[PDB]
Design a protein around this ligand. Structure first.
Ligand SMILES: [Cu+2]
Length: 166
């Protein structure tokens, strides 16, 4: 169990620690760490919730629904907080393509992978800090999809992150 705290994930922003910057986020208000589904679950319109019961409100998609963190292109620091550390296989990061439609359901086919970090089947610390590169053809509202792949289960934790790139 874990979430991306910086830039705050869509689920994390639904919690008090995230400032309640997103409203009406279901289970994300209290447990943004709990978005767990089998690896390689990428159902269109169910990326933000990973199809998980009680997280459905996260799947709404419009240009103005969610709070964005202002960021630049180039290096971006990602910080996870893990409420329950687990042995780890992988960390994968995707971002929406230039030209994507922020008023349509999220579809993984409209993202590129932009980073992949091997977990080496070790148990990470409670705070995990990684640096990924945001490609320079992205401007404006984009969604980063951060995926923490568990080493000793068939599951992963899924974190959609709303950013405004300038
Ligand atoms: Cu867990």
């Amino acid at each position: 169990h874990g979430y991306v705290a910086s830039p705050g994930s869509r689920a994390f922003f639904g919690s008090s620690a995230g400032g309640n910057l997103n409203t009406n986020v279901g289970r994300a208000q209290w447990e943004p760490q709990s978005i767990e589904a089998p690896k390689n679950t990428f159902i269109t319109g169910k990326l933000a919730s990973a199809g998980v019961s009680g997280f459905e409100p996260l799947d709404e998609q419009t240009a103005t629904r969610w709070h964005k963190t202002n960021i630049t292109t180039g290096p971006l620091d990602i910080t996870w907080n893990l409420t329950a550390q687990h042995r780890t296989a992988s960390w994968d990061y995707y971002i929406t393509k230039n030209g994507w439609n922020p008023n349509q359901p999220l579809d993984i086919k409209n993202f590129d992978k932009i980073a992949s970090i091997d977990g080496k089947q070790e148990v990470p610390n409670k705070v995990v800090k990684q640096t990924i590169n945001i490609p320079t053809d992205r401007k404006g509202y984009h969604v980063i999809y951060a995926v923490w792949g568990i080493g000793d289960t068939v599951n992963a934790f899924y974190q959609a992150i709303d950013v405004n790139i300038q």
